[PDB]
Structures are given as C-alpha cells and as structure tokens.
Q: What sequence folds into this?
C-alpha cells in the first residue's frame, strides 16, 4: 500500500496531466491503474466544475502545508468514504495539479502527489481494506 498507493497516485496524476496537454515530468496494479483512469474520466464527464470551490478554499502555494490540504480534502468525506468519493479525491488532486501548472507552480505537483499518498494511506485505506480492497474497486469499475 505504501509504495503501491504512491505509484497509483503518480499514475493518475500523470494520466490527467498528459490527457490535458500538460507535462508529467515533475515526477493487479496495472488493472487498478486502468480502472482508476477510466473512473476519473467518467466522474469528470458528469462533474466539470473542477472543485473550484475546494481549490479556492485551499489556494495552493509553495507555502501551503499538508494539514491545510487534509482539512479541505476532508470536505469530500463529511459523510464518510465510498468508491465515488475516492474517485472524486483522485480527480480533485488532478485538478490541483493542473491549477498549479497553470499558475507556473509546477514545483507543487510532486508535493500534491506526496500529500495524496499520505492522505490515501491514512484516511482512505482503512475503508478500502474493509470493503474488498482494490480488487473490489476493479471488479466495480474495471
């Protein structure tokens, strides 16, 4: 999970940046990654606001600390965790990275990736592991 999740986060963020015309140079596993990439595209297809409100609540700068990131991300889970909210969490991180590149703060991309892995391992893996693990995610979104 530690390294697994780190790799999962980097893959999704790299996918999103590539897809959107940005560089990703600031950085069954294969089945998990693919399922998550598609899940995110489906999610963003419906919700296209890009978490403007949440990103505004965060207004990320090189000075922003994890605790602030954690506090804002917690908003997605006020009613607890579920697969859709985990997908939204990945999408939110992608949105934060795109925003960071648009502001010429590409230095933040690897930082956001680290923050996401930390948050995933700390707050989301408990629920994930209790509900089938990533195997169930693939089975549900693959």
A:
């Amino acid at each position: 999970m530690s390294q697994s999740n780190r790799e999962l986060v980097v893959d999704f963020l790299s996918y999103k940046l590539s897809q959107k015309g940005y560089s990703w140079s600031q950085f069954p596993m294969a089945a998990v990654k693919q399922a998550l990439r598609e899940a995110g595209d489906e999610f963003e297809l419906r919700y296209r606001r890009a978490f403007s409100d949440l990103t505004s609540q965060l207004h990320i700068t090189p000075g922003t600390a994890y605790q602030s990131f954690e506090q804002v991300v917690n908003e997605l889970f006020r009613d607890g965790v579920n697969w859709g909210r985990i997908v939204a969490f990945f999408s939110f991180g992608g949105a934060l990275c795109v925003e960071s590149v648009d502001k010429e703060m590409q230095v933040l991309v690897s930082r956001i990736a680290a923050w996401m892995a930390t948050y995933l391992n700390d707050h989301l893996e408990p629920w994930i592991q209790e509900n089938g693990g990533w195997d169930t995610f693939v089975e549900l979104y693959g």
Observations:
- The helical segments are 2-19, 29-46, 52-58, 66-73, 83-102, 108-130, 134-141.
- The chain has one domain: 1-142.
- Residues 6 and 80 are 22 Å apart (CA to CA).
- The radius of gyration is 14 Å.
